[PDB]
């Protein structure tokens, strides 16, 4: 419900002045998603290595949500949220400068290596802390999935990519926009119901399936087919559930409840006994290294 001009006016009011091509150098592309292309670069003045997300505003899936992105990343700082540094607007290109997490994304790990249950529990704990913080501040992320989870080389876990997020209010306490990535969407999203923060808990459940099986269900299917499969299959089935502990299977079942009221909240799932199996995050470091080497080769 915002025009292109209203969106650009709002973005201009919140970014810093200047052209960032004069402030950063030695760019190298490290990732790309539905909104932006992300580079490493060096701050010309200081030498710091940063990450820079470059977004072309007219090629955006929903233009006005980029406002929430900058606002949420800088107004809701937290140890499990990628650290915002700055933002710039050059006509129709928006840049967001943030800390660089050299371990890459959780996608790199789950597609190249096999996490054990203690490593999965550790990652789930960190993601649940982030979600409890966001949800308590009335932010729904709406795009939880492995490629939006960043890793430090020491195993630090940080949520990024707030470009689909919703800030919910008393007058609009639920959302109804079809937004997210189809394979990770909760059934109440795909069936076009009003929905709330627990859609992120479902998506976390699907990301935990990624940590087991390397990918979410139905990844090869056309998006509209996947949406119908989510609507009719309900709680997805694992290929080999007998390989997982009973306590881990219970955690998954509580993330992936069809009934929104039965589904765990972030605060509730932080008390789940599965998280007591967690290993130190430093245990991720050999998986991170092995994944980077495999991708390089
Ligand atoms: N700060 C960062 N450090 C390291 N890698 C990053 C960082 N930010 C993004 N990436 C990588 O770039 C990809 C795209 O970034 P993201 O912000 O998710 O863009 P989009 O909104 O287009 O999906 C991420 O999935 C991740 O692999
Ligand atoms: Mg992304
Ligand atoms: Mg995004």
Author numbering: 260 to 556
Original authors' sentences:
PAKs act as effector proteins for the Rho GTPases CDC42 and Rac and transmit signals for the regulation of the cytoskeleton, growth, development, proliferation and survival. Group A PAKs have a GTPase-binding domain (GBD, also known as CDC42/Rac interactive binding (CRIB) domain) N-terminal to an auto-inhibitory domain (AID) and a serine/threonine protein kinase domain (KD) that is highly conserved.
This is the first example of a crystal structure of any protein containing a thiophosphorylated residue; in spite of the common use of ATP-γ-S in co-crystallisation (over 130 entries in the PDB currently list ATP-γ-S as a ligand). PAK3 is in an active conformation, with thiophosphorylated activation loop at T436. The overall fold of the thiophosphorylated PAK3 activation loop has high similarity to the phosphorylated PAK1 activation loop, with minor shift at the main chain around T415-S419 (PAK1 numbering) where crystal packing influences the conformation.
